[PDB]
Amino acid sequence: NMAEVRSYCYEASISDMASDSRCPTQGEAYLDKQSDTQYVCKRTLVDRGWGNGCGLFGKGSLVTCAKFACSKKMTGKSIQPENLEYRIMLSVHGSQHSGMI
Amino acid sequence: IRCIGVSNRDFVEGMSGGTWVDVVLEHGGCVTVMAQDKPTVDIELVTTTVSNMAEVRSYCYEASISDMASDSRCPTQGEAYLDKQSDTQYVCKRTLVDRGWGNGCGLFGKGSLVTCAKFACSKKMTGKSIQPENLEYRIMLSVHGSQHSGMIVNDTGHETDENRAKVEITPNSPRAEATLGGFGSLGLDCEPRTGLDFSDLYYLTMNNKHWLVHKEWFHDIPLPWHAGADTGTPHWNNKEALVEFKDAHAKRQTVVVLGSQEGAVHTALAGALEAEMDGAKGRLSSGHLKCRLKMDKLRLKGVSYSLCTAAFTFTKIPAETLHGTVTVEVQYAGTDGPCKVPAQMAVDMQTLTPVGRLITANPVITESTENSKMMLELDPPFGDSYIVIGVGEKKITHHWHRS
Amino acid sequence: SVLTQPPSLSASPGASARLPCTLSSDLNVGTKNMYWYQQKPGSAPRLFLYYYSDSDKQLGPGVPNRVSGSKETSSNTAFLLISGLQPEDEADYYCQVYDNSARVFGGGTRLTVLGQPKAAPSVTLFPPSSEELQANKATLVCLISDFYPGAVEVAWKADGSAVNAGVETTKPSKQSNNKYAASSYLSLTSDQWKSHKSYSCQVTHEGSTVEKTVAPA
Amino acid sequence: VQLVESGGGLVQPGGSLRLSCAASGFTFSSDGMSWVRQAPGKGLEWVSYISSGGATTYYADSVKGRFTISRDNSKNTLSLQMNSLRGEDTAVYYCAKDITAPGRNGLDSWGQGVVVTVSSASTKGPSVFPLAPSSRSTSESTAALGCLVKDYFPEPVTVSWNSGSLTSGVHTFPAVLQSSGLYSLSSVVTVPSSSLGTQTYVCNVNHKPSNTKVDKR
DSSP: OOEEEEEEEEEEEEEEEEEEEOOTTSOOOOOTTTTOTTEEEEEEEEEESTTTTOSSOEEEEEEEEEEEEEEEEEEEEEOOTTOOOOOOOOOOOSSOOGGGO | OOOTTOSSEEEEEOOSSSOOEEEEEOTTOEEEEEOSSSOOEEEEEEEEEEOSOOEEEEEEEEEEEEEEEEEEOOTTSOOOOOTTTTOTTEEEEEEEEEEOTTTTOSSOEEEEEEEEEEEEEEEEEEEEOOOGGGEEEEEEEEEOSSOOGGGSSOOSSTTTOOOOEEEEEBTTBOEEEEEOGGGBEEEEEEOOSOSSSSSOOEEEEETTEEEEEOHHHHHTOOSOEESSSOOSSOOOBOGGGSEEEEOOOSSOOEEEEOOOOHHHHHHHTTTSOOOOBSSSSEEEOOOOEEEEEEOTTBOOSOTTOOBOOSOEEEEEEEEEOTTSOEEEEEEEOOSOOSEEOOEEOSOOSTTOOOOSEESSOSOEEOOOSSOEEEEEEEEOOSSOOEEEESOSTTOEEEEOOOO | OOEEOOSEEEEOTTOOEEEEEEEOTTSOGGGOOEEEEEEOTTSOOEEEEEEEETTEEEEOTTOOTTEEEEEETTTTEEEEEESSOOGGGOSEEEEEEEETTEEEEOOOEEEEEOOSOOOOOEEEEEOOOHHHHTTTEEEEEEEEEEESSSOOEEEEEETTEEOOSSEEEOOOEEOTTSOEEEEEEEEEEHHHHHHSSOEEEEEEETTEEEEEEEOOO | OEEEEEOOEEEOTTOOEEEEEEEESSOGGGSEEEEEEEOTTSOEEEEEEEOSSSSOEEEOTTTTTTEEEEEETTTTEEEEEEOSOOGGGOEEEEEEEEEEETTEEEEEEEOOOEEEEEOSOSSOOOEEEEEOOOSOOOSSSOOEEEEEEEEESSSOOEEEETTTTOOTTEEEOOOEEOTTSOEEEEEEEEOOGGGTTTOOOOEEEEEGGGTEEEEEO
């Protein structure tokens, strides 16, 4: 009676890695795919200053994303209770010879 | 002029009179050395590379099977046999299966069954030696005084720039000395004993990544292995670690690979210090470089300049760093250049005496005409101060807060 | 953040149209969602194409298959592509990007499907008369007519050095014989008008400049 | 999908207008909305955005502190409050769905827009100045003369020449809209150069909204 319940991915592929960075006091970093369902992202605060081509010495906002693709997946499905099926075999002696084993 | 803005900064002051300074060099942190008469160099360890590592042992973490075959024998007819059961490339297993008139044999008992399969590795890891005597540290040096903002990230043309220097240190050559053009020369003698921890620590390469691994744990990795480097179809040992024989009927037994152990080892290496390479040079990320440097022949550049005459103007307000030190950048509206930049401390009235030390000693400009920019850095005293730049008229004064 | 498009482009039916949109180095074209909007005269803009890549796209409602998009990272440029051009595709087209609460539109490309072979602009330039010079004003009018695709740049000059004051030019306007016309105006004073020996109107159309001059004499 | 704007008209500098848009054909309360303006003859520029629930609003730097965007999800109406209006704000204002999708945004549907005119005058007559030839132009006697119609408020202006007698070679051009809120216009005739000393040129300007008639020599 097998109804699929939930599937897990155990091997994946990554593609289209990109990052967007912001100087301090210029707000939050932004990528157009950061709100995409198929993309995985992470925001962080990096050190920025004159070495990085920025006017002030402070914590800059950095977001990076990439597209996630599942390569191989496993599936957990439902066992409907009260929906089993046993199979039994019965064999009778006397007339039979062991070719019937 | 590097290191300005680095979180792990060390403002160690040098002993006045003769160049006798010791510094601990961390891999994520740079150190500003400041001398009584000198340029106040910035120095940083950028790369520590291990060279010419020899392969110790290789492990297979995902494999493939081919030529699966089985041979069976009835009870009391001896041992089963396949021609490839003694082959170095095949994995095998002998068992005792139940046999009887249902399986086409005369007696009821345990029959011999053997099953073999050719082993082939698909992806392999490799652990290599280190040998402390074969290290290579790379050190960058840049001096203060006359370097603009654009010289905070720049490494091209430093052989000609007197201000930057590149130095390489080896165990066979602990002493080194950098050429600094018109600034003279700076010597450097340096040796740790923690390149890695004392006669241990193989170098492990797998899955296009390179990590660092202890000896005993690497020796007891329960995966197929062969000792030396690569040779045509190397002979694997303990191949049963990645193949398993199951559910032996009479005359046939199934065999399967376990699957990739990438995630298994990656979770197992969680916790140690590791670092990457490209290419054929093992770049590590760890410090503890105990150095001792002499700036005896490290001469100056600008004692003979005159004071500024024109006006200054802030392009960036004084900004405090993590360590209480402050950087300031100004414009210079004069053709008086080249000349010395008048910088002074807190006191600012009739007959006043500067309190606090300047890190960018002897600030000068090299550009004459007309509106040049220049960077300088000050460590104001425990207290509070006014930064006064300029002289007499058209001075620039700013109050500060060493909070 | 600046989006740069050419002011005008033209082609014949059956063509593969190619409309660029340069992204300033502020952003990077490869990571941008591209929204193209089509606006025909007398109507509102309509969403023409959404494009992130060949695998992430959507044509506007009622927009044929011939419309496509692309990018090139080397020049930081986005492209709108129209295979097999048709007269109905003649319109104004604007690229657009989102950037952290900012919606940035390009200058807009005016695409012209040719149906009336290329025609050069006909210009005539006027000086100030006597009635207006009395009461101290002096305005020169430059009038341009009968030119194919409706995009001309006008440049004003006086004694050789480009003028940058008192200039207002009408937008191109479709005239009787399905061609375009416009007019540029140079407003000066009476002494400003006499100060220079000669003024000149320079109308440029498809890399070819026509030049008319006037003298106070 | 239907986006119908209203609430526009003529306002004077420092005044205020309040635009309204009724939406239908889709679940209005589930989509973000935006206003977009387009000045006469120029491109598009975003004005303001509001989210589906109304918690987040964004404004262009040229509009910040002066405009306010509102929603009534029960009535399916989008509002744009404009205060302290200046002459820059004269444009057509478009209401548009500013959607949010998985990894996708855009102005999917637009209204046809409403006209907003900011100007200080309400009725003003023009000042007419002639455009004498004063240059020969040597194109087989193509002397060209005209008249400038400067700074008038209500757009309708009709120009004749010599009381309708002169019709060949007449070219009256569409008017301009300057940032001051007024219109300017000119009309020109091509005339044989041999008749400049025989034929008197007279231009007949009619501006009914101010009930003014000018005949300029």
